Amino acid sequence: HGHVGADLAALCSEAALQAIRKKMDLIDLEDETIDAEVMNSLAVTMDDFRWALSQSNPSALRETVVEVPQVTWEDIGGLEDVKRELQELVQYPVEHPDKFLKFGMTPSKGVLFYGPPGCGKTLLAKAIANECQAN
């Protein structure tokens, strides 16, 4: 999830090198004039990509990321009161911007969740972003 395009070019290049390296037991240095059999019958497979990805290629990325999330609403079922309130506070000033100016109520600008540690706070805060298709 955290690579850049040049990192993926290096990843593909390292997978090609790994696929060549796994065939150097019969591609020997005494084969001076190289036979073209490997040049049309070698294809990189899945574990070479997994080797080049997991064992090598430290990613050149730490910073923030901007995308829609993907955790849906049925990842934490229930809590319909909280869901209905978040719909009235996030869904409606995006999916219906004109009706807010019919009677002109200014929208709010965010709530403060609070609770015990590990009740799906972040997993709920991503859910309204996934429902609104917002960033």
């Binding site: 009706k99 009677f103 200014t106």
Partner: protein, 103 residues
């Protein structure tokens, strides 16, 4: 005017919320109507929507009567009592009063 003599010790920043509460409740009734207006079963193209619904063109009374039930005073009685004690810690003619001049 009936809201005046019913909310006595409410601060000014509190009854600016209950009108945003009744606004939010009326927007909830408007999107509630627009989620079932397009949900027509046996949707005949005959008898077209030349007459619009227009369910909530303004805030009704029961929107206020429902939003008023979540009213809450922000300042307590102990802090208005604190400021009155600061008004008397201030002087405000802390002394004699009501004297006159010789003729």
């Amino acid at each position: 005017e009936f809201l005046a003599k019913m909310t006595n010790g409410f601060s000014g920043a509190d009854l600016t919320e209950i009108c945003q509460r009744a606004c939010k409740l009326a927007i909830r009734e408007s999107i509630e109507s627009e989620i079932r207006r397009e949900r027509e079963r046996q949707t005949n193209p005959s008898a077209m929507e030349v007459e619009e619904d227009d369910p909530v063109p303004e805030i009704r009374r029961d929107h206020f009567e429902e939003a008023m039930r979540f009213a809450r005073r922000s300042v307590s009685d102990n802090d208005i009592r604190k400021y009155e004690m600061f008004a008397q810690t201030l002087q405000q003619s802390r002394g004699f009063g009501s004297f006159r001049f010789p003729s």
